[PDB]
Amino acid sequence: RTRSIGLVIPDLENTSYTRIANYLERQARQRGYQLLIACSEDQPDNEMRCIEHLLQRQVDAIIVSTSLPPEHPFYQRWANDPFPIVALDRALDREHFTSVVGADQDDAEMLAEELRKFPAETVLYLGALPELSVSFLREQGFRTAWKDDPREVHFLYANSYEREAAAQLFEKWLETHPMPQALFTTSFALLQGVMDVTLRRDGKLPSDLAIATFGDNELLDFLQCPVLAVAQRHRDVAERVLEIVLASLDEPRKPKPGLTRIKRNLYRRGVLSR
Amino acid sequence: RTRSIGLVIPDLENTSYTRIANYLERQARQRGYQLLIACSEDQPDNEMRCIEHLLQRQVDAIIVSTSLPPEHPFYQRWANDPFPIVALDRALDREHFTSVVGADQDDAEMLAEELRKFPAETVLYLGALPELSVSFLREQGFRTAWKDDPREVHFLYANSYEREAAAQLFEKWLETHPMPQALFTTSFALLQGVMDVTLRRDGKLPSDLAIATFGDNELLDFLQCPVLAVAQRHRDVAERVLEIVLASLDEPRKPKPGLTRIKRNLYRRGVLSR
């Protein structure tokens, strides 16, 4: 017992991971628990050796945001081990591990439901990598809220979740199709890309466009148009992850394996903050 | 020998501290150490107990962004002690400790000298807490670059490095004077404060105001006026700190005690971005 918990995440560069790490650090310190941050750079081999380096340092538990294909046999080593691995953001084997993930589907529905209330003839759904779950979960939540609505929705998918990729595709798409009144993006990076194109061409970012995006930024309040944004309950996430770590260490018999979900918060910015 | 280093910072929320922490863990992991983060919340009492805790966990060295004044009696305990204690951002005793700090005067002048080149008449320096060391140096640097300039500079000073303090003051000042043609802020928060009121009044962020700020943000690119931004070399700072940590462990002597000013990088945004 070193009264310490390993936390493996991609990097402390992403605000989402950092804010959760922030809330978790102040959470853990509060109970005389140290937190050991070992980043993977989202590389599988790095993660595996970040794990053992925590084990070498007599860590009491690990919290992981795994980059492996979860089933990958590495974590099946601790499948029936009382040593607790608690997953964050990206789930582990749902039969041998507790995982705190988000509720992308219900989130995407809520956000989509809200955007639809805005008048707009032409609508554009912009995502990326529909092969992935986060991409599909979000599309499904959206399609759910736009089921019996008459309006046609143009769907457009980029090769990656990047600013440049979105910029290129949206610009190419503007040749055939015209500018939309309503927009739905599944990451902030996509919206950036779309905005770059609108700053080009127009010179002026829009004041006649309902924006709806995943991820949140406070600087969206300066925009001249209505924007809707969803972001994680970073603190509420941290609480739940830690409660499970403590339950496994303290209580007799660990919590049930499987997913537990936490919904995002909606934010009305741009003109909706006035 | 645990092969571990303790970091003590205010929080994992401030951009600069997190980015520095990011580039520091990635470096520390490579050299084969494990950072332990302990946040003071910028409270003296907390800061002190953190160091008690980290020391108790057999840590090899500590990096600190201290909340205490440079020659506080608490850190005189390790003044002639060979156990390394390196200082980040906020400097410790300038003769018994080595401090990796910024070049606020140099950076201010550089940024100021750049801002001058635009054709403005009414230029406004907005700062906060003038008597503080950091506030002083930035006022100092600015005056150097606007020494022989034959143009007035109304200096305005908020009573906190905060957004609403800046806004109130500026809008109350905007009664007595007309709109500046150039502008110089001493933090990002003060720039926020100014833009809030400019978004009021005008209902639109300016397109003709030459802007110079401390602290960077990519989203400044979307502005439609000239923008100059200056921010830390997180990676340089991080790796140059850690170099001193290892030199203190390995080399038969402790390196020169004193300040090592690392200069900030300049970026161009708004219309300058495109």
Domains of chain B plus CATH, in order, are 1-96 (3.40.50.2300), 104-232 (3.40.50.2300)
∠ CA B100-B102-B104, nearest 5°, is: 155
A258, A244, A261: which is closest to A97 by C-alpha?
A258
Three-state DSSP string of chain B: CCCEEEEEECCCCCHHHHHHHHHHHHHHHHHCCEEEEEECCCCHHHHHHHHHHHHHCCCCEEEECCCCCCCCCCHHHHCCCCCCEEEECCCCCCCCCEEEEECHHHHHHHHHHHHCCCCCCCEEEEEECCCCHHHHHHHHHHHHHCCCCCCCEEEEEECCCCHHHHHHHHHHHHHHCCCCCEEEECCHHHHHHHHHHHHHHHCCCCCCCEEEEECCCHHHHHCCCEEEEEECCHHHHHHHHHHHHHHHHHCCCCCCCEEEEECCEEEEEECCCC
Partnered with residue A265 across adjacent β-strands are: A231
- What is the residue type of B106? D
Residue appearing with tokens 């589907």: A105
Q: E-strand spans in A186-272?
A: 210-214, 226-231, 258-262, 265-270
∠ CA A181-A193-B208, nearest 5°, is: 85
What are the residues whose beta carbons fall under 8 Å from the beta carbon of A170, sequence distance 6 or more?
A: A126, A156, A193, A194, A197
Residues of A numbered 224-243 whose beta carbons fall under 8 angstroms of chain B's beta carbons: which are they? 224
- What is the residue type of B200? R
Helix axes B163-176, B188-202, angle to 10 degrees: 50
Say how many CA atoms lie within 13 Å of B273 toward its Cβ.
Answer: 17
- What is the residue type of A7? L
B79, B105, B106, B107: which is closest to B92 by C-alpha?
B79
Q: Per the CB < 8 Å rule, is B39 touching A26?
A: yes
Look up residue A210 and give its two tokens: 């309902």
State the first-to-last Cα distance of chain B, in angstroms, to the nearest integer. Answer: 52
Residue appearing with tokens 């080595």: B98
Q: Per the CB < 8 Å rule, is A19 touching B13?
A: yes
| Contact criterion met (CB below 8 Å) for A229 and A183 | no
How distant is the alpha carbon of residue B27 from its chain centre?
21
Distance CA B115, CA B225 (A): 13
Partnered with residue B62 across adjacent β-strands are: B6, B85
| Contact criterion met (CB below 8 Å) for A126 and A174 | no
| Contact criterion met (CB below 8 Å) for B39 and B70 | no
Residues of A numbered 90-149 whose beta carbons fall under 8 angstroms of chain B's beta carbons: which are they? none
Phi-psi region of A236 (alpha: psi -120 to 50; beta: other; left: phi over 0): alpha
Resolution, in Å, please?
Answer: 2.9
With beta carbons under 8 A apart, name residues in chain A contacting B18: 12, 18
Residue appearing with tokens 């970026």: B267
Output the CA torsion sign for B87, B92, B95, B97.
negative
Q: Residue A184 belongs to what H/E stretch?
A: strand A182-185
With beta carbons under 8 A apart, name residues in chain B contacting A203: 224
Q: Per the CB < 8 Å rule, is B204 touching A219?
A: no
- What is the residue type of A144? T
- What is the residue type of A170? F
Instruction: Tell me how far CA of residue B80 lies from CA of A38, B95, B98, in angstroms.
Output: 33, 10, 13
Check if B57 contacts A (Cβ < 8 Å). yes
Q: Per the CB < 8 Å rule, is B12 touching A22?
A: yes
Instruction: Tell me how far CA of residue A160 lies from CA of A31, A128, A131, A189, B78, in angstroms.
Output: 41, 6, 11, 10, 52
Distance CA A235, CA A80 (A): 30
| Contact criterion met (CB below 8 Å) for B63 and B7 | yes
| Contact criterion met (CB below 8 Å) for A174 and A200 | no
With beta carbons under 8 A apart, name residues in chain B contacting A19: 12-13
| Strand arrangement of the beta sheet that strand B34-39 belongs to | B34-39, B4-9, B61-64, B85-88, B98-102, B258-262
Residue appearing with tokens 């582990």: A92
CA distance A94 to chain B (A): 30
Q: Per the CB < 8 Å rule, is A37 touching B39?
A: no
| Contact criterion met (CB below 8 Å) for B84 and B59 | no
Distance CA B17, CA A153 (A): 43
| Contact criterion met (CB below 8 Å) for A266 and A26 | no
Output the CA torsion sign for A40, A44, A46, A49.
positive
With beta carbons under 8 A apart, name residues in chain A contacting B4: 57
Distance CA A54, CA A72 (A): 20
Look up residue A206 and give its two tokens: 């829009």
